[PDB]
Amino acid sequence: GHSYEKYNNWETIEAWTKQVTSENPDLISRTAIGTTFLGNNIYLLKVGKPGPNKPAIFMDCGFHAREWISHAFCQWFVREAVLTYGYESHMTEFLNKLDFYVLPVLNIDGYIYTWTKNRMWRKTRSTNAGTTCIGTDPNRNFDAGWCTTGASTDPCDETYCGSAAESEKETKALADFIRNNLSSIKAYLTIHSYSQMILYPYSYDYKLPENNAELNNLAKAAVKELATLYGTKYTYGPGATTIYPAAGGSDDWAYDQGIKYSFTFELRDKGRYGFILPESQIQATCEETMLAIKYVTNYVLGHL
């Protein structure tokens, strides 16, 4: 069965998306936005109090298969939203005024592979012509300085950028959805681990975003709020200098679409456990991360 303080396999997460929706139809609707290479359904949960128009914030988890705390956070976020609506002032206004588009797992095929074969798998599980090597790095597969830096053109490498921008069914599905709903999406948030960072554009170039000062002030405030809960220290800044240059990322691509608030989160930890974060830290990690997400949400709403 499903637990919010354990890592859940896809079969369980899938059944969870159905159950949590069935149990909260006045706050959640579920749609599929596409299929993965291996035929799994890419679910999207629209969280919020239904109403005409409504702006939105898009958040995805599970870009990279082995980053299990990411998948855990999207689920945690959804429960928080539904349980506290009507009782906590901020979440109530949030869900009244806007929708969160939550995509609990993008790279489902890879996630399954980490459960069944190799816990440290990263990429998708699509085949590549002319080689036995499997998979593309989804966060090198977007049309943002595609494959110009921090990427590989070799299918056998962990940062393979693919045959072309959006060559992967999953990345195409996400890009198609965001393009189809551009007018309403005001912020883009993508969840990864590990390193304890909040990153903003650009990662494919050392150039700074037009609203760099605002984004830095936002990231700084968000990390301060996150630390209030358990003292967890994050760093923040543009992708290229805060971690390293990496072209083709979803956050850079979302920003260049005109989504002015675009962030990558790198959750716990700093490398003691790395990708293999113990389930005993799921609760604390998700709790402090909620604070930063809600802070960003509060800000974005005030600057519509």
Ligand SMILES: CC(C)[C@H](NS(=O)(=O)c1ccccc1)P(=O)(O)C[C@H](C(=O)O)c1cccc(CN)c1
């Ligand atoms: C521990 C994390 C820092 C992950 N890095 S990693 O798995 O150790 C790694 C190791 C070797 C090559 C590429 C990535 P990540 O979440 O996978 C970092 C991510 C990416 O590589 O896609 C990243 C890096 C630079 C900029 C961004 C923002 N678009 C995002």
Ligand SMILES: [Zn+2]
């Ligand atoms: Zn990642």
